[PDB]
Amino acid sequence: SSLPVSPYESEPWKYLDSEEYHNRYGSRPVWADYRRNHKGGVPPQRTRKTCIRNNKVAGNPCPICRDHKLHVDFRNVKLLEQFVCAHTGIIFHAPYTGVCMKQHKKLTQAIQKARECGLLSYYVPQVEPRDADFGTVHGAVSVTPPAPTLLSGEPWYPWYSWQQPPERELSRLRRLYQGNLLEESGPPPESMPEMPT
Amino acid sequence: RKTRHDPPAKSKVGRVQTPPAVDPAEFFVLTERYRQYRETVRALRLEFTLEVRRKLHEARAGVLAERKAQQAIT
Amino acid sequence: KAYHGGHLTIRLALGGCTNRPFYRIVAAHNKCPRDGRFVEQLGSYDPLPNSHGEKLVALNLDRIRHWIGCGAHLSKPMEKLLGLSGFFPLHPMMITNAERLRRRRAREVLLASQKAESEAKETEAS
Amino acid sequence: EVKKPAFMDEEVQRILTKITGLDLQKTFRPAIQPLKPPTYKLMTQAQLEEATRLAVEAAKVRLKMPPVLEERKPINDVLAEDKILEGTETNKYVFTDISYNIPHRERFIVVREPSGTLRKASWEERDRVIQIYFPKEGRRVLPPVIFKDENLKTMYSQDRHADVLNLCVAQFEPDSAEYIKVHHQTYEDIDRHGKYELLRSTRHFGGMAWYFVNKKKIDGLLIDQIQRDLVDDATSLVQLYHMLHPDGQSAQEAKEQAAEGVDLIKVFAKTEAQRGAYIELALQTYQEIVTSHS
Amino acid sequence: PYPPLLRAMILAERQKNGDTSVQEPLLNLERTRMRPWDYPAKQETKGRAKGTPV
Amino acid sequence: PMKGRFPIRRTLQYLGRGDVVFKESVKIMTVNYNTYGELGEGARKFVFFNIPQIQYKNPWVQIMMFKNMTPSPFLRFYLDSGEQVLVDVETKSNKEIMEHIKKILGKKEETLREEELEKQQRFHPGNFGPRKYCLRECMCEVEGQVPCPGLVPLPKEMTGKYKAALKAST
Amino acid sequence: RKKVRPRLIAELARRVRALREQRNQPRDSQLYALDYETLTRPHSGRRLPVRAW
Amino acid sequence: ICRLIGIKDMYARVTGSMNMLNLTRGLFHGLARQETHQHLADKKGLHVVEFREECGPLPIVVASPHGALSKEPEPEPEVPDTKLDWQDVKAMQGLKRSVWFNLKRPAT
RNA sequence: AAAGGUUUGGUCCUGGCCUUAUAAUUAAUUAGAGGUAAAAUUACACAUGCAAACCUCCAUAGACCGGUGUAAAAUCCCUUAAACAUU
Ligand code: FES
Ligand SMILES: [K+]
Ligand SMILES: [Mg+2]
Ligand SMILES: [Mg+2]
Ligand SMILES: [Mg+2]
Ligand SMILES: [Mg+2]
Ligand SMILES: [Zn+2]
C-alpha cells in the first residue's frame, strides 16, 4: 500500500532533462521498447483499463505506469509530444503506444489543455471572415424608432391592462352562473408585489 | 387509449360533470382578451396567407420567369 | 401510418434525456406521434438555462410564416413562445396568469405583515 | 475635404501588397495535417513555369488581407417594455431568427428579460448564438482561453504571432473589441522585439504596417526593412505615411524638395521620425555597403 | 399595431429597400372580424347521431 | 487485374467525368456507327469511351445503338416536342463529337449549379436530429448548454427524484 | 403480383351494412327522447351536462 | 526486412502462397529493380515535379535531367490503358472492407 | 486481413478446416454505490384493476396515441388523375 514517491511531482518537466531519463530512454520515446502480451496475432482493440489498482501494479505495466517519475501533466510538453504524431498532429490511439485506457484518457486531456494554453503547438487553418459584408446599418443591429405606446408608457395593446368590466356585465354573469360563483376580483396590483422574505 | 368498442369502466359510472366556478370580474376580462387576441392573430394569419400567394405567383409568372422561358426557346 | 383527417400543426416535440428536456419546434400533421413523423423542423427550444443564464429559443420565422399562411394551427405552448419573442401578441392566459400571481403575492405580503404585527403584539407582551 | 485613405483603397492595397512580399516557400509551407501520398507529373520547362505561375496566383488569394474595421458600437435598443410579465419568469429568453437566407448582421436576435423588457441582443449575444445555429469551422461558442494575456505571452515567446492572428480571425469578428485588442497586442509585441519578419509573406503584414502608420511608429519597420536590403519597400512605407498624414511636416517637406526614392526616407528621419538618428545610420550603412561592394 | 418584433422587421425592411418613412405599420381588422361564439351555426352541414342503441 | 480492355472505364470517377448533361427536351439518342472503316474511327471511340459517361449523367435518356446499317456514322436526338436533331460525326474525333453535342443540346454550367443549390434548400445546420440528416442530435452537445445526464450527472436539485422527496417533505 | 385475390365477402358486407342503415334510420322522436327524472337519453344513455338541467 | 533496410512507411499485401523464401526473394527482387526519380528524369529528359496536398499547388522539383532538358511534352492520353487491380479499385467503388482491415495495432 | 496453425520421410503447389478481432442473447462462477440508455421466449390461454371523453341538450372525439410482426416477394423510386371522413 506504499507506492513510490516521485521527487519531480512539483516540476514534472525536470525529469525529462535529468541524466536518469537519458540513460533509461536516450532519445527514443518512452514507449519504444514496450511490448504487449496477448493471445493471437491480432491484438485486442482496447488496451487494459488500468495498470494500477489500489497501489498494486499489473504484470506488464504500460510505458507511463511502469515509470512512476513520468507524470502526465499539461505543463510537461516534452512528454506529451511523444504521444502526438509530428507529421499529422494526431494523438495516437492507445493500442499504438500500449498505454492503458486510464492514462490514455489522461494523456488526451493534458495534450488538449496544453494546446489551449499555447504551450503545445498545433496547426491553425486559415479561414475567411464569417460575413461577406460588414455593414451595421440594418435595423436588426441598429435603433428602431420607438413605438408610440412605448414613448407614452402605455401597454402595447390596450387589453394587456386590466379594464374594469361594466357593472351591468358583471350582473349578467352572476345570473348565468348563479349558484357556482367566486368572490369578485378587483384590479390587480399595479406592479409585482416584492416577494416576502 | 381505449377504442369505441371497449367497455366503460365500472369505477366511473357515477361520474357527473362538476363545472368550474366562475369569477365574474376575471371571466369577463378574460373573455374580451380572447376575442381581441384572436382578432389580431387572424389579421396576421391573413397577411401571412397573402405573402405565400404573392411569392408563389412571382415564381410561377413573374418577370424573370417569362424571360428565361423565351430565352431558352430562342 | 395512413392518416385520414387532421390538420397541420406547429408544436414542440420533446427530446433529450431524463431530467434534461429539449424541444424541437416542428410542423407536423396533428395525428402523428409527438416525436414521430413531421413535415418540417421550424426551430428548437432549450428550456434549461445555459452558462449565461439564458433559455435559448430558435425560430425559423421565414418558414413559420409560410406554414401559418397555409393553415397550420399552433399549440398553446408555441403561442406562448411566439408571444414572448414579440412575433405574436402576448397570449390572454399569459396576462391572466401574471395577474393571478400578482394577487397571490399581495396576499402573502399582507399575511406576512399581519404576522409581523402579531409578532409585534408578542413583543409588546414581552 | 480630401478623403482619408482606406485600408481597401486600390492604392493602399498596392503598397501594402508590395511591402508584404511573396515567398512561395513560406506561403505554402507544409501543414501539419493528415497526409496523403504525393503525386508526380513530368513537365517541361514551359509547363513548370506555368505551374509556378498558378502557384503565384493561388499565393495571392492565400495572402488576401483580413478586414481592418472600426470597433462596433454597442447595441442598446428596447423594442418593448411589457411590464405585465414582470416577475413571471426567472431566466432571460434569447430568440434567434434562423431563416437561412439572411446575412448574419441582418438577423433579428431579441431578448425577453425577466423584467418584461424586449430588447435587441448585444454583440456578445449575437456572435454566441450565431455560432450555435450557424457553426463556422474554427470558431467556438465560448471565447477560447488562449487569448488571455498570460497565454498570449506564451505564444509570443514561441514566435507564433501568425497563429495568434489566424486564431483571432477564426474566433472573433473583425470589428469586435476582442479582435482589435488581440491584433493590437500582437503588433505591439512585434514592434518592441523587432520581429517584423515573422509576418512577411503572410496576410497579416498589411494590418501590422497599417497600424504602425496610423499610430505614427513606422520607425522600427523602416530600420528593419533597410537592414534587410528591402529599401524599395521602405520607400513605399514612407509614401503610405505621407498619404495618410498629408498635413504632416514630413509630407510637406517632401513636396517642397520633390523627394523620391531614398530621399523620401531621409526626409522622414529629419522631420517626423521618432528615432531619426538610427534611420539615417542604417540607411547610410546600407548605402556604404552597396557602394563599396558594388 | 403590429406585434413588437413583427413591427421592427417591417420597418427594417423599409430602410433596406430604400423606402424612407415614419408611418407606423398597422394591421387591418375589418377583413377578419369574428362572429360571437353563440352565433347560430349551419345545421345543414351538422352531423346526426347513429341508430345503434347503447 | 480488372478484366476487359481499359478497365478504368468501370470506375465511378471515370463515369463522373462526363460533362454532357442533356436538356430536359432530349429523350432518345440513337447511335449509328460502323465497326469497320477509316472515317468512323472517332465514332467507334465515342461508343467505347463516351456513351458510358453520357448515360451515367442522363439515366432517363434512352441510348440505343445500331451497327453497320448505313454507310456513314451519325447521331440522331429525339426531343419531347417531336423535333429530331441529326448530327453527322464522320471524320470527327470522339472528343469533337462530345463537344458538339454539349453545345447544341447540353445544359449550361449556370443552370446545373442553380439546381444543385435548390436541392439542399431544406437542410439547415441549426436543425437537430439523427446523424443521417443533421449535425447534432441534441442541444446537450452544444458548448455552454447543460450536458447530457448520461455523460455528466445533473445537479440533485434539477432531478425529479429529489424534487418529489421535497414535495412529500413539505 | 397477381396473387392479391378478390374479397367478395368484404364487398358484400359493406353494401349489406349500408343498406340496413338506410332502412332502419331512427327518427327525431327516438334520438332526442328524454327521461326527465334522470335527464338521460334512452337511445344512447347519455346524461345531459349539469349546466343544462 | 523493411526495418533492416530502413524503410519506415509503406503498405504491402501478400497473396497466393506464403512461402517465406519466395516472399523474401520476391521482395528483394522488386525493391532492387525500382526506379528513382532521377533515373526517370534522365530516361525521359523531363523535370519530375511533386504535388503535395498539404503544400497546395506549390510545384516541388524532385529531379531534373542531368543532360539536356527536352521541349516535347510527355503525351497525356485522354483515357489511360493502365491495368488496374480490382482490390485497390474496389475501395473507391464504395464496397465494404473486411472487419480485419485497418484494425488498431501497435506501432511498427 | 499485415495474417497465423494444420496434409508429407521431406520439399513445392493446390485446397478445406480452424485460430487471432467485433457485437448480441443465454448459462456457470462472482459483484458495492451512483447517473444514463434499453428491457425482448411464445399471433399460446388469460383471473382482477385501469387505458376516452368532453360539454347548456345538438354535435365533435373514442378512425388518433399505444401494441404486435399476422399475412405477403410481398417493395423502392417515379408519373398521372381525382377527390379528402380535413385545415
Ligand atoms: S442526448 Fe442530449 S440530453 Fe441526453
Ligand atoms: K492454409
Ligand atoms: Mg356549442
Ligand atoms: Mg441471465
Ligand atoms: Mg404508433
Ligand atoms: Mg410470418
Ligand atoms: Zn498503465
Author numbering:
A (entry chain O): 42 to 238
B (entry chain U): 27 to 100
C (entry chain M): 10 to 135
D (entry chain R): 63 to 356
E (entry chain 0): 165 to 218
F (entry chain T): 2 to 171
G (entry chain 0): 3 to 55
H (entry chain D): 325 to 432
What is written in the article reporting this PDB entry?
Mitoribosomes are essential for the synthesis and maintenance of bioenergetic proteins. Here we use cryo-electron microscopy to determine a series of the small mitoribosomal subunit (SSU) intermediates in complex with auxiliary factors, revealing a sequential assembly mechanism. In this study, we determined sequential cryo-electron microscopy (cryo-EM) structures of stable assembly intermediates and initiation complexes at 2.8–3.2 Å resolution that involve six factors: RBFA, TFB1M, METTL15, mtIF3, mS37 and mtIF2. In conclusion, the model for the SSU progression through the assembly pathway includes a sequence of binding factors as an integrated network, with RBFA serving as a regulator through its allosteric control mechanism, which was not reported in a bacterial counterpart.
In the same dataset, we also observed a class with a subset of particles with folded rRNA and the additional density that is different from TFB1M, suggesting a later sequential assembly intermediate. Approximately 7% of the SSU particles in this cryo-EM data showed identical structural features and the presence of the same additional density that were also detected in the particles from the TRMT2B-depleted cells, and the latter was identified as the N4-methylcytidine methyltransferase METTL15. METTL15 is the mitochondrial orthologue of the bacterial RsmH and is responsible for the methylation of C1486 in the SSU rRNA decoding centre. In coordination with METTL15 binding and rRNA maturation, RBFA adopts a large conformational change in pre-SSU-3 (from in to out), which is enabled by a pivot point between the KH-like domain and CTD. Therefore, the association of METTL15 triggers the conformational change from RBFA-in to RBFA-out. This implies that METTL15, in addition to its enzymatic activity, has an important structural role in guiding the biogenesis pathway and stabilizing the conformation that excludes the RBFA from the mitoribosomal core.
